[PDB]
Amino acid sequence: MLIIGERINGMFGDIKRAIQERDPAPVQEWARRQEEGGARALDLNVGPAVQDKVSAMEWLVEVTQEVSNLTLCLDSTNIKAIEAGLKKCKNRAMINSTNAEREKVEKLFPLAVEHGAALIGLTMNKTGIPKDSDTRLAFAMELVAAADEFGLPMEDLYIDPLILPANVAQDHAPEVLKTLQQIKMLADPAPKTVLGLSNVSQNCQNRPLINRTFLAMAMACGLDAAIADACDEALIETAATAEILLNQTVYCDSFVKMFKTR
Amino acid sequence: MLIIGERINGMFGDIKRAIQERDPAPVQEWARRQEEGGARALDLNVGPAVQDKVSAMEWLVEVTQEVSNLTLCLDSTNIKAIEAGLKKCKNRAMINSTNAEREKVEKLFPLAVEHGAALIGLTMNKTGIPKDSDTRLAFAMELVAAADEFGLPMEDLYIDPLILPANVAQDHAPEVLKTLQQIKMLADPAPKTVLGLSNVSQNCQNRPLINRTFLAMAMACGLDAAIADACDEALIETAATAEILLNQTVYCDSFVKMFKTR
Amino acid sequence: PLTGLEIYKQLPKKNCGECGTPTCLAFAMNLASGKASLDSCPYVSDAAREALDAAAAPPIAKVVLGAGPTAVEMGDETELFRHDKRFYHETAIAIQVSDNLSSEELKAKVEAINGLNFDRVGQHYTIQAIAIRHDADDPAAFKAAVASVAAATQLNLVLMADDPDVLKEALAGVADRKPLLYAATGANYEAMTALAKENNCPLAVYGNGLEELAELVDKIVALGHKQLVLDPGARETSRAIADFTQIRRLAIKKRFRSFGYPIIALTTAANPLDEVLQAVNYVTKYASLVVLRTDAKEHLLPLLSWRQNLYTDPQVPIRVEEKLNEIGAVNENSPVYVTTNFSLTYYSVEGEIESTKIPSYLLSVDTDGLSVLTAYADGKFEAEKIAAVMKKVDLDNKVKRHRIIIPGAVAVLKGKLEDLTGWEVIVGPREASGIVAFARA
Amino acid sequence: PLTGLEIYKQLPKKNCGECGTPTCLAFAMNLASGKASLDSCPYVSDAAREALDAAAAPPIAKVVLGAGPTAVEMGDETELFRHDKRFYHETAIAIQVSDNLSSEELKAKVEAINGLNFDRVGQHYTIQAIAIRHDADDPAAFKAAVASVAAATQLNLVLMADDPDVLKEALAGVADRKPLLYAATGANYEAMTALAKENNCPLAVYGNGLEELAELVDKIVALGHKQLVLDPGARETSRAIADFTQIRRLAIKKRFRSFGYPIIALTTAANPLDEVLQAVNYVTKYASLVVLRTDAKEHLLPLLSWRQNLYTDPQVPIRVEEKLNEIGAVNENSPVYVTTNFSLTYYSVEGEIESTKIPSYLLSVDTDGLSVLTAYADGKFEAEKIAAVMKKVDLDNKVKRHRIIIPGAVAVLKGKLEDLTGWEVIVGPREASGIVAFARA
Amino acid sequence: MAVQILRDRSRAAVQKVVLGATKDQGGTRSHTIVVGGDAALPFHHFEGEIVNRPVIGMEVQDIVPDWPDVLKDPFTDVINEPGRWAQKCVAEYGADLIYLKLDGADPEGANHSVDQCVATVKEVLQAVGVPLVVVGCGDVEKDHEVLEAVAEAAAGENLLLGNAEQENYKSLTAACMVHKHNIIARSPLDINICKQLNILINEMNLPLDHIVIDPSIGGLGYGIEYSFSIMERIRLGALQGDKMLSMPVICTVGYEAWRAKEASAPVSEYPGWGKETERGILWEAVTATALLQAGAHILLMRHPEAVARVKENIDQLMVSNAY
Numbered sequence A, B: 001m002l003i004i005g006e007r008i009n010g011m012f013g014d015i016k017r018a019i020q021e022r023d024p025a026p027v028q029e030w031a032r033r034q035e036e037g038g039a040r041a042l043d044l045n046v047g048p049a050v051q052d053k054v055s056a057m058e059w060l061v062e063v064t065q066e067v068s069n070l071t072l073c074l075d076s077t078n079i080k081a082i083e084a085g086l087k088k089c090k091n092r093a094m095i096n097s098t099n100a101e102r103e104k105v106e107k108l109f110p111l112a113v114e115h116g117a118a119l120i121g122l123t124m125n126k127t128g129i130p131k132d133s134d135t136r137l138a139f140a141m142e143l144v145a146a147a148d149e150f151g152l153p154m155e156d157l158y159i160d161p162l163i164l165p166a167n168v169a170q171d172h173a174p175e176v177l178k179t180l181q182q183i184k185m186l187a188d189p190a191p192k193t194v195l196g197l198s199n200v201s202q203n204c205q206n207r208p209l210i211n212r213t214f215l216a217m218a219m220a221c222g223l224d225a226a227i228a229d230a231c232d233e234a235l236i237e238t239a240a241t242a243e244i245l246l247n248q249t250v251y252c253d254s255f256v257k258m259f260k261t262r
Numbered sequence C, D: 001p002l003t004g005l006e007i008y009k010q011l012p013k014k015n016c017g018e019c020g021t022p023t024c025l026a027f028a029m030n031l032a033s034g035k036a037s038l039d040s041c042p043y044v045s046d047a048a049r050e051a052l053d054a055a056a057a058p059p060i061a062k063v064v065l066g067a068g069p070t071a072v073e074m075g076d077e078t079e080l081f082r083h084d085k086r087f088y089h090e091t092a093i094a095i096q097v098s099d100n101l102s103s104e105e106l107k108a109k110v111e112a113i114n115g116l117n118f119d120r121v122g123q124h125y126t127i128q129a130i131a132i133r134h135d136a137d138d139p140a141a142f143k144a145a146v147a148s149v150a151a152a153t154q155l156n157l158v159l160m161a162d163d164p165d166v167l168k169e170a171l172a173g174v175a176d177r178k179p180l181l182y183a184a185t186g187a188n189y190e191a192m193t194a195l196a197k198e199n200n201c202p203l204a205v206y207g208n209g210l211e212e213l214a215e216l217v218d219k220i221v222a223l224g225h226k227q228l229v230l231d232p233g234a235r236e237t238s239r240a241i242a243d244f245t246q247i248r249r250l251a252i253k254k255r256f257r258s259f260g261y262p263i264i265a266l267t268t269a270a271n272p273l274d275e276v277l278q279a280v281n282y283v284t285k286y287a288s289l290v291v292l293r294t295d296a297k298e299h300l301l302p303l304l305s306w307r308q309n310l311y312t313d314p315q316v317p318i319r320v321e322e323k324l325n326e327i328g329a330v331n332e333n334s335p336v337y338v339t340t341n342f343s344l345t346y347y348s349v350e351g352e353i354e355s356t357k358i359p360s361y362l363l364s365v366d367t368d369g370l371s372v373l374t375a376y377a378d379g380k381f382e383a384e385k386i387a388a389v390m391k392k393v394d395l396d397n398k399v400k401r402h403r404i405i406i407p408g409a410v411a412v413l414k415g416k417l418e419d420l421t422g423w424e425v426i427v428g429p430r431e432a433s434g435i436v437a438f439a440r441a
Numbered sequence E: 001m002a003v004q005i006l007r008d009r010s011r012a013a014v015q016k017v018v019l020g021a022t023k024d025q026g027g028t029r030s031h032t033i034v035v036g037g038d039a040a041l042p043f044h045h046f047e048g049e050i051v052n053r054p055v056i057g058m059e060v061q062d063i064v065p066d067w068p069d070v071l072k073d074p075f076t077d078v079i080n081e082p083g084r085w086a087q088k089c090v091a092e093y094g095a096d097l098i099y100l101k102l103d104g105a106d107p108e109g110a111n112h113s114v115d116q117c118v119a120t121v122k123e124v125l126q127a128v129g130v131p132l133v134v135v136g137c138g139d140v141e142k143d144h145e146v147l148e149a150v151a152e153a154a155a156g157e158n159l160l161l162g163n164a165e166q167e168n169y170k171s172l173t174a175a176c177m178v179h180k181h182n183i184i185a186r187s188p189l190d191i192n193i194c195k196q197l198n199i200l201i202n203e204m205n206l207p208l209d210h211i212v213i214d215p216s217i218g219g220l221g222y223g224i225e226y227s228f229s230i231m232e233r234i235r236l237g238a239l240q241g242d243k244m245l246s247m248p249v250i251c252t253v254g255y256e257a258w259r260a261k262e263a264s265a266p267v268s269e270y271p272g273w274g275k276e277t278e279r280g281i282l283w284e285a286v287t288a289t290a291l292l293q294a295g296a297h298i299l300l301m302r303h304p305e306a307v308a309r310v311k312e313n314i315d316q317l318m319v320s321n322a323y
């Protein structure tokens, strides 16, 4: 399981105040505490506030890789900011994200191969987020076909069925699992998958109980990556345990400690 | 999810003494403490401790339904003891366990239709527990084919992939999940399933973390029932949260409390 | 795909291993998985062809009523409940007209049937076909009846008679538009299928109960005509609801190939008001075609409204047409309110505005139908697209003032909008129920 | 069981929708889900046949070596590691003998080959075939050799002659049996393919390297013969491990149909000791048939021992017989030990008791293969199953004293078993390595 | 068409453990033998680099062993003299390491003094110039006194102290750290206990490249496949990034092969098996050959001719089969 830190996001207070005045201290501190939690990836988002997405993204990268060697994850809908950030990356990074829109595919898939990075693909288009797994799976195959079309390693493709809150979109959660499980019939080797785990507990009671529960249920369906709370110790335990139950890592009595210090 | 109380078993110290001395008090107590936990079924096993089964099995049925109206589950290999238990059952019954052998099928399958109970089938033979999922499915298919043979409702058939410890049989857990995932695709309407959830944490550090995590992963694969410790609050919360994420029960802010007091 | 159990009982019982698999029960597992083709086993009955179709084909086949732009499609549904997914093809409404009426009374009635086109809340409701029945005492009166109707309307048609020899004389000229042939009975199904084969028209299958219906269907299937609609013969609404449920359940859930076809219902209520309410039950109870006996414009709008609503998509939020919605009487003076075109958001706003009896204008910009808050965090409702719809709605010419009212949920967009708009942005209440306490003050 | 990509990258990419699906990529999804049949799209030809033959078929083909109870099965494997699942068919052992040898030397060697069956640990090791290679200058010496061998031995045969004419002349009298034809080469594969075609026998494919093997196989397959065994011509054990792995990998992981057949390995080590060690590497590296030269029992025993161990299902544990087993002389007044039939438990006691020295009896009760703690918890090891086995050998008459020794682990069984049995009970150490410390006491 | 060679890229590699020191390193050995460094499956050169070939150590005891009559024959001239025993295994039989198995420390047996066990170790250090692998007899209390005293006096030689299990790792690990020595981790045919043990040993701040795994291999025909599968699983994990299974695998074929009847049983007793000479030579050779395909780095053998044949096998498997 790949834990991607989602604390460094412009929607958060301290992060947004940091980018405005270019304060590296709050950003770097969360880059450590998430890594200490067991996260092997750091998702960077500038937020909707800052008008200049391009330069703000480059700043988040240059100060994060300064105190961490983890695989950075660029999070912006603006392609101009993504490519701008990739040029500043000192190591392997991730592009988040792209949809089945051809206008986006033709200008992001080559970009992924160009920098040799990872590309996260969304199962959607200009319309929005579907429900039926048969629909999401259709968008996913285009992303798989796009990888082979532009010469991108299939193991570098992360398909995201886009999970919605479990209260107002309860019928989405089982459809996401039904999507993940059937992704294994797309390619050989099959592409990896990723989810924004925190979204499933959006405005629900006892968020951690819903987050870690859905994480386990997703890994059983073949979840290869997840963007969730890296500071949640109760979540890291579930991620480690579920990985053991999938026989992805040899069992030991310190299996939880081995996940954090992996 | 149907949680069956496992505490009433002849392997424990209190229950074993409660059989030899014929003391209803421990049996009656654990029949309540598990019901409060959220269990809607009780697994009744005399254990290998007691010499005679028929005398002990019948004694359990009477003292259990004295202070509880929950669904009674009989657990034994002795056919005479099992059939003797169904005699004193006023409420709904459930039998466990049966294998794929015809020498066990035609001696247990018609017994289920007779009293109109639920039959828990195993995916194994005299040699031992299978490894892959293709073998479990082949044995599960025999259970479904025999279910339509003796005239038994498909929703009353519970398939048991037989989960094993995650330390010695770590390579069995991902096969059990693959089994469950392909059980709902071998028949329509699909037969229900059941696991010995507590066995996956046999001789492992932090057993509850192993138990509840595997439950969610199994429910994602289509687990309709499970036999585990109903006195574990952390386990009950996972069983409730998983139903919400599977859209089996309408979400509410008190979703945890509602499954506990269903 | 198909359930492994159902292919096993479809399979014989030889256990001969000619397939390459030890037993038939193990070969059933390979089929459901996909480890082998079913063509290897020779020891199979006609169920082989059944396994070929019952698995691949959808539970309810699609049959088209008519040809061209005036052709409507029935059947093709896969849901017992609209909240799960949705209902694809709407119910085909048909008005019945007898032939024993004079030519002047026949044309005058069909004339009103074509006038059953309704426009409401931005959308348009239309009926599909016209039912012609044979109540005369002579066969020749039916040929002149259909010709009068067919040369009057361009909508779909559906003829109703028992004798095939009477029907074919009236089908000669109207055969091109493929009118529905109602109905096939257990006495003349042989002559009906033959006539429906030459003209390639959908054939309406009738049966007294769910038993005779299932039998007579298979009779026509064996003849080579698979374009069928089902009529359980239920007259009362209680009988129909149960029967229509069975035709819909067995086809979808049990793969019943005898009931895997759309349903045609008949309103038998004498009173016109009772007829509509009985028709509402049908269009809700999985019906695909209903024949009414009311041509009044008052008894069609409520029915047609419910039809459009029931056959919408839930996962997809409902969209109010983008535009400006005046409330009550609008003075150039009256206040402007901007919001989101979500049905929920503008519906609430509409309730708030009209309920407080305050004349104004609602600018409901196209957010994709998303709520003001949803638009707000997915960059669909931003001071730039909003000032954009301000000049696009053409509201500036309908007021003397230059002030617009935004939701108290996104007040933060007022300044940047006040600059872009050229108008004065005021930040109202976060809930529309306190808008009446904002107007007076 | 087929990837949507694999299916897609084999379609015309026209997006005509003649299949009833908007695009090919969407139809590829429908094939992987089984929503439609591949026979629908009239386009393409070899693509459809190759896919169906590659989809619903094992990675390694199954070629049986002859007929009758003597015949063994080769190939048919789906794993790279034994722990992932299991290794099915054991390696075929074949002893090579020259044809230029005299009759008395031939018969003497063949006679020794027939006695290469071993008996150890309650198991039975047997070889498979005998290799007859053509070394002589006269083609008549080859037919006189094979006919001579076929009279003495009843085992399988495998002929090694380049010239097809020399082979057929010798194959004529033994055609009805097994004889594997070694080997078809890129210069004489035409005549060799026809020989195995009429006689219906397996054919060996040779190729100097990895690439030459691929080209030759595809040609032989296109002639109507599939039953083949591959020989990459690897004469070095290091060069062999690499090549042998590829055939097993490419056929399973990449579905390479040219390498979807078992492998025949040839030992080249001069020293008979180095030959067996080189054979251990082969039987471990996916080689299905190996051709040895040394026929000594001193060499075949450790080789056939490792062959048996490697091809045992990890899930079923190894089990010894449920019988009293005697260690040392046993005077009829020696101690009595009770233990489980599990092969790793038994020889934990046999090696430890026999190590101390002196006679003793050792009763292996039938747990079905489960260990003392194991069968303890599964209840297959109670005071009841033990006392009943005490009397299943009538043990008391054999030993003057009534005393038995129980595992320190399951020692608690002490009381209850000492009563039902009527035999006194002494509970030993937890670990069997204390069998030396109990005898002293 | 054509053929593409499938090459499985390894995400990680097995640890590189250094055995022995030199005059410059503070030791007295002639050379330093390194094991591990493999970046692929056992002897798969086409998809990884096999820098260091597996080595063979010969068992030398401080006292005369209780081995069968056949096995004792090639040592009869030096079997009762450890200093001359180890010196023969190197020069004559060509051994890579000297496996000093102290059975004389057993209180029930020879009951050698603590200063005598350290005298035997210091004797071999003067006899040969190859690295040593010194393990105890099996007694918990004795080995804690022996191995500690040995590590203290042989400090600087960089030896390989052995027999450290799950319930007993605290006493031995503490000695290895201070005196800069390596350590062997023994596991009762359990990869879980094996991995867990390596964690416990490392948590005391002992480097990962100073640890070697002893899976307690089963004898040929007596459950060798149970150890064969485990050794593979450890090998896969070490390549998949599992650093707790990245330790080289040492095997004790000498003890496990010569404890079977099939190895030393006379031909007259079991006619179907054949001569006992060729059998015993091949029994220890085959049981070690199979483990080489499982990823055995250090083999602990006894029989001279058995070594000479496995040595030949290794020399052949190290021939690069790269495409």
Ligand code: B12
Residues within 6 Å of the ligand: A129, A164, A168, A169, A199, A202, A203, C317, C318, C337, C338, C339, C340, C342, C344, C345, C346, C348, C349, C369, C370, C371, C372, C373, C374, C377, C378, C405, C406, C407, C408, C409, C428, C429, C430, C431, C432, C433, C434, C435
């Ligand atoms: C349904 C819904 C969804 C649906 C959207 C369907 C739709 N058509 O809206 C879906 C499932 C897609 C969803 C998703 C999201 N949602 Co949402 N959603 C809701 C929800 C549950 C109710 C929507 C609704 O019908 N509201 C009813 C309408 C009528 O309200 P309204 O548009 O605000 O209008 C009212 C008032 O503002 C006022 N009013 C309106 N116009 C005007 C004008 C004037 C002048 C005045 C005076 C008053 C006025 O009157 C109306 C009622 O009287 C609310 C929770 C709630 N019930 O309040 C959350 C909520 C709006 N969602 C929210 C969020 C966060 C999201 C996401 C961004 C989640 C994420 N992590 O990305 C996504 C958006 C993008 C995406 N699609 O991923 C948040 C917004 C706050 C926040 N940023 O945290 C809310 C409030 C949930 C919460 N946090 O409690 N959502």
Ligand code: B12
Residues within 6 Å of the ligand: B164, B165, B168, B169, B199, B202, B203, D317, D337, D338, D339, D340, D342, D344, D345, D348, D349, D369, D370, D371, D372, D373, D374, D375, D376, D377, D378, D405, D406, D407, D408, D409, D410, D428, D429, D430, D431, D432, D433, D434, D435
């Ligand atoms: C591998 C294993 C399994 C395997 C079985 C492997 C096999 N071939 O037997 C599997 C996974 C199938 C399994 C199943 C079971 N297992 Co289990 N299993 C283990 C395990 C890991 C090792 C067994 C083993 O091979 N021991 C090695 C053998 C050689 O030891 P042994 O049989 O005890 O023999 C030694 C001594 O007893 C003595 N000895 C033996 N005989 C004699 C005779 C004499 C005269 C003398 C002097 C000495 C002597 O010497 C022997 C060697 O020195 C143990 C834990 C452990 N590491 O000990 C648990 C264990 C044995 N299992 C146990 C249990 C509980 C079970 C299950 C009931 C699990 C469940 N919840 O259903 C199931 C049984 C039912 C079922 N099958 O559904 C328990 C037993 C205790 C208990 N019941 O509370 C243990 C101890 C786990 C634990 N809780 O620590 N198990």
Ligand SMILES: CN1c2c(nc(N)[nH]c2=O)NC[C@@H]1CNc1ccc(C(=O)N[C@@H](CCC(=O)O)C(=O)O)cc1
Residues within 6 Å of the ligand: A006, A007, A009, A011, A012, A013, A043, A075, A096, A097, A120, A160, A162, A163, A194, A195, A196, A197, A198, A199, A227
């Ligand atoms: C949409 N998520 C997402 C993604 N990327 C992908 N591919 N998929 C996703 O669903 N990247 C962004 C986000 C994941 N990261 C996050 C970040 C924060 C919160 C969150 O819950 N934040 C708090 C705000 C707290 C504060 O403002 O102080 C919240 O309550 O919403 C959730 C997910």
Ligand SMILES: CN1c2c(nc(N)[nH]c2=O)NC[C@@H]1CNc1ccc(C(=O)N[C@@H](CCC(=O)O)C(=O)O)cc1
Residues within 6 Å of the ligand: B006, B007, B009, B011, B012, B013, B043, B045, B075, B096, B097, B120, B160, B162, B163, B195, B196, B197, B198, B199, B202, B227
């Ligand atoms: C074998 N399990 C099982 C089943 N039924 C089926 N179909 N499958 C199963 O695997 N019914 C019985 C049991 C499930 N119930 C249980 C009961 C106890 C423990 C358990 O963990 N017991 C303690 C022992 C405590 C004591 O000895 O006092 C343990 O540590 O093992 C686990 C599961």
Ligand code: SF4
Residues within 6 Å of the ligand: C011, C012, C013, C014, C015, C016, C017, C018, C019, C020, C021, C022, C023, C024, C027, C040, C041, C042, C043
């Ligand atoms: S060929 Fe047909 S009848 Fe024969 S065993 Fe196979 S499935 Fe059964």
Ligand code: SF4
Residues within 6 Å of the ligand: D011, D012, D013, D014, D015, D016, D017, D018, D019, D020, D021, D022, D023, D024, D027, D041, D042, D043
């Ligand atoms: S008919 Fe064939 S070529 Fe045309 S779209 Fe369908 S699959 Fe593609």
Ligand SMILES: [Ca+2]
Residues within 6 Å of the ligand: A184, A190, A192, A221, A222, A223, A224
């Ligand atoms: Ca996966």
Ligand SMILES: [Ca+2]
Residues within 6 Å of the ligand: B183, B184, B190, B191, B192, B193, B222, B223, B224
């Ligand atoms: Ca199910």
